[PDB]
Amino acid sequence: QYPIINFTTAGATVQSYTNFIRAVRGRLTTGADVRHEIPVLPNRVGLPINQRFILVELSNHAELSVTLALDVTNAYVVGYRAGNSAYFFHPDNQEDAEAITHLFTDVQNRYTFAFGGNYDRLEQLAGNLRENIELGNGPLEEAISALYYYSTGGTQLPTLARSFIICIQMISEAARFQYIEGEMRTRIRYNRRSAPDPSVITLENSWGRLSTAIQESNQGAFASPIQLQRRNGSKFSVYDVSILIPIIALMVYRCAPPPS
């Protein structure tokens, strides 16, 4: 059975959220693969199906619960269960399609969305870009309700798409980036909902590239600089793993580390 991590928005605090994200990271990877002080997610190649997923059960003040399924290789939300229905994003390949047949096997009604779960698609469906979708404990509380009521016709697709966008950033992106975890902690601390600024958005967009640049680096030095953005939207270059150590918490596996 896949590991389950519980979080509730009901009376959520900085500490309870911090505990949650730490637990997610702990279940996503062993931490045995660390490169320049940054842990790496397990290699997809040869990973047994019995170790492929973790479950995040989200509860809210409305006394509703949903369970998200996360792929350990990339922290992607691949689908969710609410009551006796489960929904999965359109799989990218045959391996992923087979993999999701091992999730929520006890549930009565299982569906595959005809759309994928990437931001590009979800933003199109939501009718809003990430830059205009508010994040925080309130948005998450509401997202849990929206996911819960989808199967019974209580949630329009743009609201569902928006709700996924909220969950993905507050769970998966926070797990990937200490910086994004910090941004969410701030929102929770002051109970103030706000859309993510360019520093958050550019990190999310660059996670794959940053992971590769770090893993392919010459002793930490990037061959090609990566452009990120500050909070005010101004651009700066990253040349080295060093400045990313306090920013990135998990990388996607790209290759084996070079000889030590």
Side-chain angles (χ1 to χ4, degrees), residues 1-91 93 95-123 125-155 157-234 236-260:
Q1 203 171 357
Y2 296 124
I4 306 151
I5 305 101
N6 293 94
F7 178 73
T8 183
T9 53
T13 58
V14 173
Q15 194 61 66
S16 74
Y17 179 74
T18 302
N19 294 345
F20 165 56
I21 297 304
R22 272 165 201 182
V24 173
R25 292 187 185 131
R27 292 295 192 183
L28 283 171
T29 194
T30 56
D33 185 353
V34 176
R35 304 183 216 177
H36 307 272
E37 298 172 47
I38 307 163
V40 187
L41 294 167
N43 187 6
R44 173 209 137 258
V45 184
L47 187 66
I49 192 63
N50 80 326
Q51 280 160 41
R52 187 58 182 263
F53 301 110
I54 63 162
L55 303 175
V56 171
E57 193 184 353
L58 301 168
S59 301
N60 71 358
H61 175 67
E63 272 290 332
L64 308 173
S65 291
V66 298
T67 305
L68 304 176
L70 279 67
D71 185 329
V72 302
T73 65
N74 54 21
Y76 271 61
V77 178
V78 301
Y80 84 100
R81 179 192 74 84
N84 266 291
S85 296
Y87 295 85
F88 302 91
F89 297 117
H90 177 61
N93 56 57
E95 183 190 288
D96 290 340
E98 197 284 331
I100 62 159
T101 71
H102 297 256
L103 287 160
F104 309 126
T105 58
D106 57 298
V107 109
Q108 291 290 320
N109 312 100
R110 294 170 86 266
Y111 307 94
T112 312
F113 288 132
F115 55 89
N118 287 1
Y119 290 138
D120 275 354
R121 176 63 53 233
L122 291 179
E123 287 171 345
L125 301 184
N128 270 130
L129 299 165
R130 278 168 287 157
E131 67 177 35
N132 300 131
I133 294 156
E134 289 160 348
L135 302 174
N137 199 59
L140 189 58
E141 164 80 34
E142 292 154 15
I144 294 157
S145 289
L147 263 61
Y148 189 87
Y149 289 116
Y150 180 70
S151 66
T152 50
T155 310
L157 189 67
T159 307
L160 184 78
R162 190 186 315 117
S163 298
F164 284 137
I165 286 164
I166 294 158
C167 290
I168 291 157
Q169 291 177 277
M170 296 192 69
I171 301 159
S172 301
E173 303 291 9
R176 290 168 189 138
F177 293 99
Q178 299 106 319
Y179 182 83
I180 297 176
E181 187 203 346
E183 286 256 11
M184 298 309 104
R185 283 164 88 261
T186 297
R187 283 161 174 80
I188 293 159
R189 192 178 305 280
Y190 305 107
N191 197 36
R192 291 291 183 181
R193 65 179 76 199
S194 56
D197 70 34
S199 71
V200 175
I201 298 305
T202 56
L203 281 172
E204 299 174 350
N205 293 341
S206 302
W207 185 60
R209 183 141 293 160
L210 291 162
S211 296
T212 314
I214 292 162
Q215 291 171 54
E216 300 278 28
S217 70
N218 287 289
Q219 306 155 358
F222 297 176
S224 304
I226 293 163
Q227 187 179 263
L228 297 176
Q229 281 170 225
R230 294 181 190 85
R231 298 184 175 279
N232 66 8
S234 64
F236 72 96
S237 291
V238 177
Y239 298 97
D240 201 273
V241 66
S242 67
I243 64 155
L244 300 170
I245 299 166
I247 298 176
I248 303 169
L250 301 164
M251 294 183 283
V252 58
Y253 187 99
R254 297 306 206 195
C255 56
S260 61

